[PDB]
Amino acid sequence: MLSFQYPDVYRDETAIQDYHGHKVCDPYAWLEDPDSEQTKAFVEAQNKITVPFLEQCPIRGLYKERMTELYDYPKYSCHFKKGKRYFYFYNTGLQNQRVLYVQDSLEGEARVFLDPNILSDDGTVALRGYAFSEDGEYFAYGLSASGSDWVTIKFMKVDGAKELPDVLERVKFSCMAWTHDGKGMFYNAYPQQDGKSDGTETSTNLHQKLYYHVLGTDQSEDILCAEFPDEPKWMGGAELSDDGRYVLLSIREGCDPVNRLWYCDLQQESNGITGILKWVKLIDNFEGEYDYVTNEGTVFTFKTNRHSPNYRLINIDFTDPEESKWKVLVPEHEKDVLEWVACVRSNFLVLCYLHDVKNTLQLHDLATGALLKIFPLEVGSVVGYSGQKKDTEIFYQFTSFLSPGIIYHCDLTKEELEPRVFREVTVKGIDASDYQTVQIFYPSKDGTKIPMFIVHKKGIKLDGSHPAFLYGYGGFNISITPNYSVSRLIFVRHMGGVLAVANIRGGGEYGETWHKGGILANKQNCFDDFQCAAEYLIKEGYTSPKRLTINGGANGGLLVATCANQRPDLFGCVIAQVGVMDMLKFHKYTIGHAWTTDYGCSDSKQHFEWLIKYSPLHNVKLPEADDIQYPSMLLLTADHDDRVVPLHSLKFIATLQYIVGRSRKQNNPLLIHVDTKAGHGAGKPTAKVIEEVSDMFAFIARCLNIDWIP
Ligand code: PRO
């Protein structure tokens, strides 16, 4: 029969909970405890069968070698100036973590400023956030170990790259902002909690507070500047205005792009920062987002979505704060989303728009908002930018599906502006001209036209014979734009596959209306959109059900897992990374309470009724037809993923193996791989990234029996 046997997993049939009258059984509830011998044994047993399966066919080694070769290309970030020096991140190619360099001039020799690689043998300690003092002489940086969201903030004196004694603990989802007097830095921290705080715990994160750390002191001396004891879920991030006069507090609750905005005129403090600041509650509700751009005196420019779904720029004068008095600096565009805006060279605004899922970059006048210059870009994404108000030049990084980055530079002091190539890297082995990217719009179930990028070798016959890899996310106002992925291109070139990315609802591709189209009561829209994408690829002849692989991560993991339950006949392989699988209990762990803005919460009868319909953990069912089985599935998670606690995947795989894996007609494998010293994904070292993609494509290869193409 099969080559391996699924592990014995105890079913606690007494675990029954009542959700507003509906009895729900959770037989693997015990997997919620990561510290138990039972759970440890479970993980060990699952990995024991997954690893040999993935490593059996030599195609994995072929893929790993090719990935190690092709991924070995110089990787730079935009240069950015702080004080009298320039900084930039650079990875020579295969370093586990990118290194931060410093140079005293653009033509000067660069030296290593911060090398995270020497902090661990395996590169599992990574930089997570940083902040330079206004004068650029001091530097704060966060470090996370094993992929955890938890951070320890450390400090350095820039001149000489001197280590300082200051260390801040209990930092997570924190701001980092220095006051311009150079005395200290604002940051967020959570209260002491029982148990561990290393990324392996599941404990809910509440009561985050805003503190001020004076350089040269112990964290126990830190000043508490803002706290919301009556609102446990609020999170207040601080930033200083460009002139350093005001502390702007952005309070968020949940993941919607909205925030309260309070301010503190530092000059009005009785005796400096000594306790809870004299906050003026400018915007004291969660009805809209207000993202600070710059200010001229009391006139503050904010990027907002207040009655502007595609976003716009408005000016609020603190001296005449009523909404009826706000000035619209740059009106909302009928369809293009204003993604972000930066102020540079005092009176210039850099605006980045998303037009049909492709970026555009424009320069505008701060005083009038009028368009001054269009920066030419090919089809793709702007994924990096540098240029603060006092800077006189900008750098920006562009990427696409077929090419790594091109970093451009533009000296804004020249009357005739014209960006110039500053850095460009070419991957030897992947000739971009051999492939093509197309964008099509397909109708979903309800008729809504959804965009989808498709990348493939030029001149293929659309006869349905090609394996395909369809990616999707769908939620949280996140736009899935073009990105350079050598791993995916190896699938195209060496596995003869077709790549597709569906910009389903719930994302931010078409503004807040697109986001609202895939949340709460309408979450099913996401799944319908994605299923329709698969149907489009099949109908048009790009692939066939048995040769189609779907992939998503986190909320995207929820996407592909649900699609496997709803339309098992439509896919051949499903790879769900760090997915949210238990939609009834997600809100109980770590930062999960924040996702209720997209999903709702089971505590509500109304929400429960939406959730129970698509929750992956609660919708595993044998297909009715004798000729339909579940697709091959691979769940990927890690023991320090404190963003989406691994229990989601643990309970889901147990359920799949028991309900579906035991069926005689099920021949496709249902596996999970739980990595160690890793988390959700941010900061994952190069070595691990390579192993992961090798596991993914090896799985696809074995399940669909795809031959390697040298
Ligand atoms: O998608 C992610 O990365 C997690 C889970 C949904 C919200 N944030």
XYZ file of C-alpha atoms and ligand atoms in Angstrom:
718
model
C 0.000 0.000 0.000
C 1.547 3.323 1.080
C 5.286 3.624 1.778
C 4.801 5.032 5.282
C 2.296 4.936 8.142
C 0.785 7.996 9.824
C 1.609 8.403 13.553
C -0.712 7.309 16.340
C -2.468 10.431 17.640
C -4.786 10.309 20.647
C -8.288 11.715 20.187
C -9.798 13.361 23.241
C -13.436 12.679 22.431
C -14.553 14.490 25.604
C -13.304 17.836 24.281
C -16.659 19.344 23.369
C -17.368 23.069 23.511
C -20.643 24.885 22.942
C -20.546 27.834 20.564
C -23.887 29.624 20.913
C -25.792 26.342 20.803
C -23.496 24.600 18.317
C -21.484 21.773 19.876
C -17.930 21.650 18.527
C -15.562 18.733 19.152
C -11.821 19.488 19.336
C -10.139 16.051 19.796
C -6.605 17.399 19.355
C -7.020 20.353 21.698
C -4.110 18.900 23.663
C -1.781 19.902 20.812
C -2.255 23.526 22.012
C 0.373 22.869 24.682
C 3.785 23.065 23.016
C 5.630 21.978 26.155
C 4.038 18.614 26.792
C 5.652 15.255 26.153
C 2.564 14.374 24.086
C 2.997 17.365 21.769
C 6.789 16.953 21.510
C 6.276 13.261 20.621
C 3.680 14.280 18.024
C 6.068 16.703 16.306
C 8.886 14.173 16.370
C 6.676 11.486 14.892
C 5.413 13.688 12.030
C 8.871 14.944 11.046
C 10.026 11.321 11.117
C 7.861 10.468 8.111
C 8.007 13.830 6.283
C 11.760 14.133 5.998
C 12.448 10.778 4.317
C 9.546 11.457 1.922
C 10.964 14.815 0.817
C 14.550 13.557 0.618
C 13.919 10.257 -1.231
C 13.901 11.546 -4.794
C 17.264 13.027 -5.933
C 15.358 15.936 -7.526
C 15.544 17.738 -4.162
C 19.340 17.731 -4.282
C 19.217 18.951 -7.869
C 16.892 21.778 -6.849
C 18.946 22.649 -3.748
C 22.158 22.838 -5.760
C 20.583 24.979 -8.468
C 19.060 27.268 -5.817
C 22.416 27.587 -4.040
C 23.988 28.562 -7.369
C 21.365 31.002 -8.635
C 20.506 32.649 -5.327
C 24.200 33.481 -5.001
C 24.022 37.031 -6.366
C 24.907 40.341 -4.656
C 21.940 41.753 -2.706
C 21.883 45.469 -1.836
C 19.402 47.797 -0.146
C 19.130 51.517 -0.975
C 21.826 53.705 0.528
C 20.456 56.058 3.167
C 22.130 58.972 4.894
C 22.110 59.514 8.639
C 24.049 62.525 9.862
C 27.351 62.813 7.978
C 27.476 59.164 6.818
C 25.797 56.757 4.406
C 24.546 53.297 5.311
C 23.271 50.334 3.329
C 22.511 46.663 3.799
C 24.371 44.180 1.564
C 24.655 40.386 1.351
C 27.525 39.118 -0.792
C 25.205 36.346 -1.952
C 24.900 33.418 0.439
C 25.467 35.030 3.841
C 22.789 33.956 6.329
C 21.953 37.557 7.258
C 22.545 40.735 5.295
C 25.191 43.031 6.752
C 24.886 46.758 7.495
C 27.712 48.873 6.090
C 28.777 52.468 6.667
C 30.767 54.943 4.571
C 31.627 58.585 5.163
C 30.812 59.608 1.576
C 29.237 58.126 -1.570
C 32.703 57.697 -3.107
C 34.301 56.529 0.144
C 35.341 53.016 1.144
C 32.650 51.141 3.028
C 33.255 49.270 6.256
C 31.212 46.774 8.241
C 28.969 48.487 10.780
C 26.773 45.607 12.028
C 27.226 41.975 10.997
C 24.465 39.791 12.422
C 26.189 36.662 11.089
C 28.712 36.574 13.887
C 25.872 36.466 16.445
C 25.027 32.804 15.794
C 26.547 29.732 14.042
C 23.348 29.222 12.076
C 22.294 32.806 11.438
C 19.167 32.516 13.598
C 19.716 35.853 15.381
C 18.503 38.632 13.154
C 18.001 42.368 13.086
C 14.358 43.364 13.650
C 13.857 47.127 13.450
C 16.337 49.969 14.056
C 16.485 53.703 14.642
C 19.246 56.254 14.283
C 19.310 59.364 16.453
C 18.407 62.568 14.593
C 22.070 63.610 14.304
C 23.006 60.099 13.179
C 25.584 59.632 15.932
C 23.737 57.006 17.949
C 21.941 53.883 16.804
C 19.312 51.539 18.307
C 18.531 48.119 16.856
C 16.355 45.164 17.682
C 17.479 41.543 17.672
C 15.152 38.534 17.480
C 16.375 34.964 18.113
C 15.063 31.919 16.301
C 12.489 33.861 14.304
C 10.450 35.045 17.304
C 8.570 38.365 17.199
C 10.192 39.132 20.592
C 12.964 41.693 20.479
C 15.859 42.865 22.637
C 16.867 46.449 21.746
C 20.612 47.246 21.899
C 22.583 50.430 21.178
C 25.782 51.664 19.519
C 27.710 54.900 19.152
C 28.121 55.255 15.378
C 31.608 56.761 15.386
C 33.803 53.732 15.920
C 30.801 51.388 16.017
C 31.072 51.251 19.807
C 28.803 48.924 21.762
C 26.833 50.639 24.547
C 25.517 49.072 27.803
C 21.839 49.794 27.166
C 19.558 46.798 26.686
C 15.725 46.850 26.511
C 13.702 43.669 27.019
C 10.044 42.704 26.599
C 9.889 44.558 23.306
C 7.446 43.381 20.627
C 5.581 45.190 17.790
C 7.480 48.273 18.855
C 8.172 51.753 17.567
C 11.674 53.168 17.903
C 11.918 56.943 17.832
C 14.587 59.217 19.274
C 13.766 62.663 20.600
C 15.803 65.243 18.657
C 17.626 66.369 21.785
C 19.455 63.010 21.605
C 18.624 62.170 25.214
C 16.621 59.003 24.682
C 14.298 56.898 22.579
C 10.609 55.934 22.602
C 9.764 52.220 22.347
C 6.970 49.780 23.289
C 7.043 46.943 25.800
C 4.675 44.376 27.290
C 4.255 43.620 31.008
C 6.116 40.732 32.671
C 4.267 37.470 32.189
C 4.500 34.019 33.717
C 6.062 31.298 31.624
C 8.363 31.754 28.675
C 8.702 34.689 26.332
C 10.996 33.155 23.726
C 8.574 32.552 20.865
C 7.496 29.053 21.976
C 4.689 30.209 24.274
C 1.126 30.861 23.131
C 0.286 33.535 25.730
C -1.905 36.413 24.463
C -0.147 39.806 24.197
C -2.078 42.593 25.929
C -1.449 45.907 27.657
C 1.391 47.042 25.440
C 2.730 50.371 26.711
C 4.805 53.312 25.453
C 8.071 53.983 27.315
C 10.905 56.473 26.998
C 14.475 55.215 27.550
C 17.169 57.709 28.516
C 20.489 56.660 27.007
C 22.951 55.718 29.726
C 20.398 54.355 32.182
C 18.802 51.048 33.135
C 15.498 49.990 31.661
C 14.018 49.994 35.184
C 14.303 53.797 35.054
C 12.323 54.161 31.825
C 9.491 56.662 31.814
C 5.940 55.470 31.114
C 4.467 57.913 28.574
C 1.246 56.246 27.478
C -0.825 53.268 28.582
C -4.451 52.208 28.037
C -5.422 49.998 31.027
C -9.103 50.115 30.076
C -8.329 49.018 26.493
C -5.987 45.971 26.660
C -5.811 45.577 22.864
C -4.701 49.120 21.999
C -1.162 49.665 20.803
C 0.345 53.134 20.635
C 3.347 53.821 18.414
C 5.349 57.055 18.690
C 7.289 59.034 16.094
C 8.747 62.550 16.203
C 7.698 65.234 13.736
C 10.425 66.338 11.270
C 11.161 69.495 13.263
C 11.327 67.415 16.471
C 8.722 69.566 18.208
C 5.924 67.031 18.457
C 5.551 63.407 19.507
C 2.795 61.849 17.329
C 1.069 58.828 18.858
C -0.701 56.455 16.490
C -3.014 54.118 18.373
C -4.230 50.970 16.707
C -6.604 48.209 17.766
C -6.749 45.343 15.327
C -5.372 45.288 11.758
C -7.623 47.716 9.867
C -5.794 50.649 8.292
C -7.207 53.109 10.854
C -5.690 54.835 13.914
C -6.330 57.403 16.610
C -3.786 60.236 16.375
C -2.776 62.150 19.478
C 0.071 64.612 19.749
C 2.363 66.109 22.334
C 4.090 69.456 21.848
C 7.310 68.658 23.709
C 7.898 72.355 24.449
C 4.715 72.330 26.525
C 5.904 69.646 28.920
C 6.306 71.026 32.447
C 9.834 69.638 32.940
C 10.729 67.398 30.000
C 9.607 63.795 29.629
C 8.869 62.730 33.226
C 5.658 60.666 32.958
C 2.360 60.489 31.016
C 2.675 63.273 28.410
C 0.141 66.070 27.845
C -1.526 64.301 24.935
C -3.896 66.372 22.779
C -6.403 63.950 21.233
C -6.564 65.379 17.697
C -8.254 62.321 16.196
C -9.823 60.245 18.965
C -11.596 57.424 17.116
C -10.717 54.520 14.773
C -12.679 55.810 11.766
C -9.709 56.468 9.491
C -5.974 56.238 8.999
C -3.686 59.243 9.498
C -0.115 58.549 8.418
C 2.210 61.442 9.114
C 4.096 62.755 6.107
C 5.529 66.077 7.319
C 4.618 69.402 8.893
C 5.332 73.084 8.443
C 4.697 74.632 11.829
C 1.224 73.614 12.987
C 0.148 72.491 9.503
C 0.409 68.696 9.361
C 0.306 66.678 6.140
C -1.178 63.176 6.528
C -1.842 60.349 4.093
C -5.433 59.250 4.853
C -8.280 56.988 3.760
C -10.925 59.055 5.579
C -13.756 58.963 3.014
C -11.070 58.169 0.490
C -10.781 54.371 -0.144
C -7.839 54.825 -2.572
C -6.151 57.243 -0.108
C -5.262 60.923 -0.370
C -3.148 63.648 1.224
C -4.726 66.164 3.573
C -3.420 69.043 5.650
C -4.654 69.439 9.229
C -3.735 72.622 11.068
C -3.462 71.905 14.788
C -4.660 75.496 15.459
C -7.888 74.914 13.494
C -8.360 71.080 13.836
C -12.053 70.634 12.878
C -12.564 68.265 9.956
C -14.605 70.847 8.059
C -11.402 72.958 7.895
C -8.976 70.302 6.637
C -7.419 71.011 3.241
C -7.102 68.321 0.539
C -3.509 68.669 -0.729
C -3.548 65.771 -3.179
C -7.069 64.423 -3.968
C -7.873 60.723 -4.136
C -7.474 59.144 -7.580
C -10.548 57.407 -9.038
C -8.827 54.013 -9.102
C -5.094 54.145 -8.268
C -4.176 53.516 -4.639
C -1.749 55.971 -3.079
C 0.547 53.466 -1.343
C 3.000 55.679 0.499
C 4.380 59.190 0.496
C 7.659 60.661 1.678
C 8.767 64.263 2.148
C 12.265 65.071 0.893
C 14.438 68.158 0.261
C 12.118 70.266 2.431
C 9.309 70.926 -0.034
C 9.118 67.870 -2.271
C 6.734 64.950 -1.806
C 7.496 61.533 -3.304
C 4.263 59.684 -4.097
C 4.110 55.963 -4.901
C 0.877 54.693 -6.529
C -0.352 51.204 -7.387
C -1.926 51.208 -10.864
C -3.393 47.786 -11.725
C -0.959 46.161 -9.306
C 2.189 47.877 -10.734
C 4.008 50.762 -9.012
C 4.499 54.312 -10.228
C 6.708 56.980 -8.584
C 5.988 60.716 -8.842
C 7.439 63.907 -7.359
C 5.046 66.620 -6.168
C 5.229 70.115 -4.711
C 4.521 70.181 -0.967
C 2.824 73.628 -1.018
C 0.291 72.910 -3.783
C 0.386 69.139 -4.276
C 0.909 69.652 -8.001
C 2.673 66.966 -10.008
C 6.241 68.015 -10.881
C 8.015 64.896 -12.168
C 7.270 61.331 -13.205
C 10.072 58.841 -12.502
C 10.045 56.231 -15.286
C 9.627 52.621 -14.194
C 9.255 49.296 -15.944
C 6.412 46.959 -14.892
C 7.038 45.907 -11.318
C 7.338 47.059 -7.705
C 9.153 49.753 -5.746
C 10.400 47.828 -2.721
C 12.876 50.269 -1.212
C 13.221 54.025 -0.783
C 15.375 56.577 1.018
C 15.102 60.340 1.400
C 14.044 62.265 4.511
C 12.955 65.900 4.744
C 16.493 67.241 5.284
C 17.975 65.029 2.547
C 18.634 66.433 -0.917
C 18.542 63.197 -2.884
C 16.504 60.004 -3.135
C 17.318 56.355 -3.766
C 14.655 53.791 -4.692
C 14.742 50.108 -5.475
C 12.747 48.490 -8.241
C 12.065 44.764 -8.748
C 9.959 42.542 -10.991
C 9.249 38.863 -11.656
C 12.128 38.377 -14.108
C 14.804 40.658 -12.768
C 16.472 41.281 -9.360
C 16.665 44.937 -8.275
C 17.896 48.077 -9.949
C 18.539 50.779 -7.342
C 18.143 54.299 -8.786
C 19.563 57.582 -7.458
C 18.307 61.122 -8.026
C 20.003 64.295 -6.850
C 17.123 66.662 -6.151
C 19.312 69.778 -6.147
C 19.613 69.722 -9.926
C 17.147 71.918 -11.804
C 16.680 69.205 -14.389
C 15.916 66.056 -12.423
C 16.634 62.665 -13.963
C 17.164 59.430 -11.998
C 20.257 57.360 -12.776
C 21.071 53.704 -12.224
C 23.081 53.396 -9.003
C 23.321 49.614 -8.695
C 22.127 46.798 -10.943
C 22.718 43.078 -10.504
C 22.221 40.319 -13.089
C 21.551 36.672 -12.249
C 23.714 34.628 -14.610
C 21.701 31.587 -15.611
C 18.182 33.008 -15.856
C 17.790 34.855 -19.156
C 14.769 37.112 -18.550
C 14.135 37.488 -22.296
C 13.139 33.809 -22.486
C 10.159 34.413 -20.219
C 7.170 36.723 -20.184
C 4.723 38.131 -17.677
C 1.114 38.830 -18.546
C -1.696 40.364 -16.524
C -5.277 39.262 -17.144
C -8.551 39.963 -15.313
C -10.893 37.035 -14.756
C -14.471 37.099 -13.502
C -15.121 35.625 -10.054
C -18.364 33.855 -9.018
C -20.234 37.130 -8.503
C -18.796 38.675 -11.659
C -16.113 40.847 -10.025
C -13.030 41.058 -12.280
C -9.894 39.904 -10.425
C -6.322 40.615 -11.646
C -3.826 37.788 -12.025
C -0.194 37.806 -13.133
C 1.009 34.792 -15.079
C 4.676 34.148 -15.799
C 5.869 31.501 -18.226
C 8.381 30.536 -20.889
C 7.718 32.312 -24.177
C 5.819 30.369 -26.834
C 4.334 27.541 -24.776
C 1.285 25.762 -26.155
C -1.700 26.281 -23.850
C -2.692 22.616 -24.010
C -2.973 22.134 -20.240
C 0.166 20.004 -19.976
C 2.224 22.295 -17.763
C 2.525 22.123 -13.995
C 1.424 25.408 -12.394
C 2.116 27.210 -9.129
C -0.678 29.565 -8.079
C -0.017 31.940 -5.214
C -2.539 33.939 -3.204
C -2.933 35.795 0.108
C -6.161 37.822 0.231
C -6.568 39.966 3.278
C -5.347 42.668 5.602
C -5.146 45.321 2.898
C -1.971 43.699 1.619
C -1.219 44.050 -2.095
C 0.619 41.149 -3.726
C 2.808 42.936 -6.273
C 5.615 41.760 -8.590
C 8.679 40.398 -6.792
C 11.853 38.650 -7.909
C 11.974 35.037 -6.839
C 14.758 32.777 -8.117
C 13.080 29.820 -6.369
C 9.964 30.253 -8.492
C 11.995 30.794 -11.662
C 13.793 27.472 -11.087
C 10.332 25.913 -11.053
C 9.666 27.549 -14.429
C 13.041 26.794 -16.051
C 13.945 23.476 -14.424
C 10.511 22.014 -13.757
C 8.815 23.521 -16.838
C 6.171 25.222 -14.768
C 3.838 28.194 -15.072
C 3.697 30.793 -12.234
C 0.504 32.678 -11.331
C -0.390 35.218 -8.630
C -4.085 36.058 -8.106
C -4.862 39.499 -6.613
C -7.989 38.295 -4.864
C -10.199 40.445 -2.651
C -9.264 41.174 0.939
C -6.004 42.637 -0.356
C -5.295 46.301 -0.899
C -4.907 46.245 -4.700
C -7.969 48.385 -5.249
C -8.075 50.229 -1.958
C -10.222 49.802 1.103
C -13.176 48.634 -1.011
C -11.006 45.704 -2.212
C -10.017 44.970 1.371
C -13.620 45.071 2.616
C -14.614 42.778 -0.235
C -12.695 39.952 1.493
C -13.315 40.216 5.223
C -15.959 39.393 7.858
C -19.229 38.210 6.256
C -17.575 38.301 2.847
C -14.455 36.295 3.632
C -15.795 33.575 1.344
C -15.161 36.000 -1.532
C -11.438 35.329 -1.152
C -11.871 31.575 -1.514
C -14.295 32.002 -4.443
C -11.845 34.387 -6.181
C -8.901 31.977 -5.713
C -10.871 28.928 -6.855
C -11.917 30.939 -9.948
C -8.267 31.738 -10.643
C -7.485 28.005 -10.664
C -10.459 27.458 -12.953
C -9.186 30.170 -15.298
C -5.696 28.646 -15.573
C -7.273 25.271 -16.403
C -9.852 26.554 -18.901
C -7.298 28.664 -20.759
C -4.945 25.683 -20.982
C -2.076 26.767 -18.739
C -2.462 23.673 -16.569
C -4.777 20.873 -15.384
C -6.103 19.994 -11.873
C -3.657 17.133 -11.406
C -0.692 19.377 -12.334
C -1.783 22.402 -10.285
C -0.141 23.431 -7.031
C -1.505 26.210 -4.787
C 0.546 27.970 -2.108
C -0.046 30.652 0.498
C 1.401 31.622 3.864
C -0.341 32.651 7.115
C -3.657 34.237 6.053
C -2.612 32.721 2.678
C -2.213 29.391 4.454
C -5.860 29.735 5.524
C -6.610 30.452 1.873
C -5.093 27.332 0.401
C -6.237 25.049 3.218
C -9.858 26.162 2.805
C -9.599 25.761 -0.948
C -8.404 22.179 -0.395
C -11.505 21.484 1.720
C -13.921 23.253 -0.646
C -12.612 22.101 -4.044
C -10.255 19.095 -3.542
C -10.898 18.159 -7.171
C -9.330 21.387 -8.437
C -5.809 20.871 -7.163
C -3.004 18.401 -7.276
C -0.829 19.766 -4.511
C -1.277 22.224 -1.649
C 1.571 23.793 0.334
C 0.286 25.789 3.287
C 2.926 27.775 5.179
C 2.399 28.907 8.805
C -1.342 29.035 8.235
C -4.192 30.075 10.492
C -6.217 26.845 10.567
C -8.392 27.033 13.702
C -10.644 29.972 13.011
C -12.603 29.428 16.215
C -9.649 29.850 18.548
C -7.088 31.973 16.653
C -7.874 35.019 18.789
C -6.783 33.341 22.026
C -3.044 33.186 21.307
C -0.222 35.749 21.159
C -1.251 38.610 18.810
C -4.199 36.727 17.263
C -6.738 39.013 18.903
C -5.613 41.621 16.363
C -6.928 39.671 13.346
C -10.589 39.956 14.346
C -10.861 43.029 12.181
C -10.548 40.817 9.046
C -12.119 37.601 10.372
C -14.528 38.408 13.164
C -14.366 36.502 16.466
C -16.158 33.287 17.495
C -17.300 34.957 20.724
C -19.993 36.546 18.563
C -22.906 34.400 17.354
C -22.990 36.286 14.034
C -19.245 35.859 13.483
C -19.277 32.221 14.534
C -21.766 31.515 11.763
C -19.375 32.884 9.114
C -16.268 31.262 10.631
C -17.602 27.749 11.070
C -18.372 27.577 7.345
C -14.783 27.852 6.179
C -12.538 27.246 9.217
C -10.064 24.656 7.804
C -9.830 22.648 11.058
C -13.618 22.278 11.079
C -14.291 21.468 7.439
C -12.137 18.418 6.680
C -14.551 15.988 5.039
C -14.141 13.001 2.720
C -15.137 13.972 -0.806
C -18.456 12.348 -1.758
C -17.387 10.992 -5.141
C -15.342 7.774 -5.104
C -13.048 9.211 -7.787
C -12.078 12.324 -5.794
C -9.530 12.301 -2.970
C -7.757 15.196 -1.245
C -4.770 16.774 -3.028
C -1.304 16.039 -1.726
C -0.794 18.482 1.145
C 2.296 19.839 2.863
C 1.994 22.090 5.917
C 5.099 24.007 6.940
C 5.526 25.620 10.357
C 8.206 26.145 13.019
C 8.427 25.869 16.778
C 9.116 29.554 17.375
C 6.361 30.884 15.124
C 4.734 33.116 17.712
C 2.854 35.080 15.049
C 0.654 32.105 14.025
C 1.188 29.565 16.822
C 2.088 26.113 15.376
C -0.839 24.426 17.115
C -2.943 25.625 14.135
C -0.973 23.355 11.826
C -0.548 20.588 14.388
C -4.292 20.188 14.918
C -5.002 20.515 11.195
C -2.589 17.813 10.066
C -3.800 15.453 12.809
C -7.371 16.019 11.543
C -6.432 15.507 7.901
C -4.577 12.284 8.662
C -7.403 10.838 10.701
C -10.432 11.871 8.603
C -8.896 11.657 5.105
C -5.585 9.807 5.505
C -7.312 6.658 6.777
C -9.522 6.429 3.694
C -8.714 3.662 1.239
C -9.044 6.034 -1.733
C -6.533 8.518 -0.332
C -3.141 7.859 -1.893
C -1.908 11.472 -1.902
C 0.282 12.259 1.168
C -0.801 14.678 3.931
C 2.359 15.819 5.724
C 3.664 18.510 8.076
C 7.231 19.619 8.723
C 7.955 21.582 11.914
C 11.297 23.356 11.727
C 13.424 24.296 14.737
C 14.970 27.665 15.649
C 12.639 29.358 13.184
C 9.399 31.325 13.310
C 6.841 32.973 11.027
C 9.509 33.793 8.435
C 10.955 37.278 8.985
C 14.696 37.161 9.554
C 14.973 33.540 8.458
C 18.607 32.866 7.493
C 19.576 32.111 3.929
C 20.531 28.503 4.747
C 17.002 27.811 6.042
C 15.327 29.638 3.148
C 17.159 27.345 0.735
C 16.162 24.198 2.639
C 12.538 25.338 2.699
C 12.164 26.048 -1.007
C 13.992 22.791 -1.716
C 11.434 20.925 0.430
C 8.550 22.696 -1.282
C 9.498 21.989 -4.866
C 10.745 18.482 -4.022
C 7.314 17.774 -2.635
C 5.623 19.090 -5.796
C 8.011 17.015 -7.902
C 7.335 13.757 -6.079
C 3.574 14.194 -5.812
C 3.034 15.162 -9.468
C 5.995 13.055 -10.725
C 7.720 15.943 -12.512
C 11.082 15.284 -14.177
C 13.951 17.712 -13.623
C 14.944 19.628 -16.754
C 18.706 20.435 -16.713
O -0.935 36.602 7.577
C -0.142 36.711 8.548
O 1.113 36.757 8.424
C -0.729 36.794 9.959
C -1.996 35.955 10.117
C -3.063 36.868 9.567
C -2.690 38.222 10.119
N -1.218 38.155 10.183
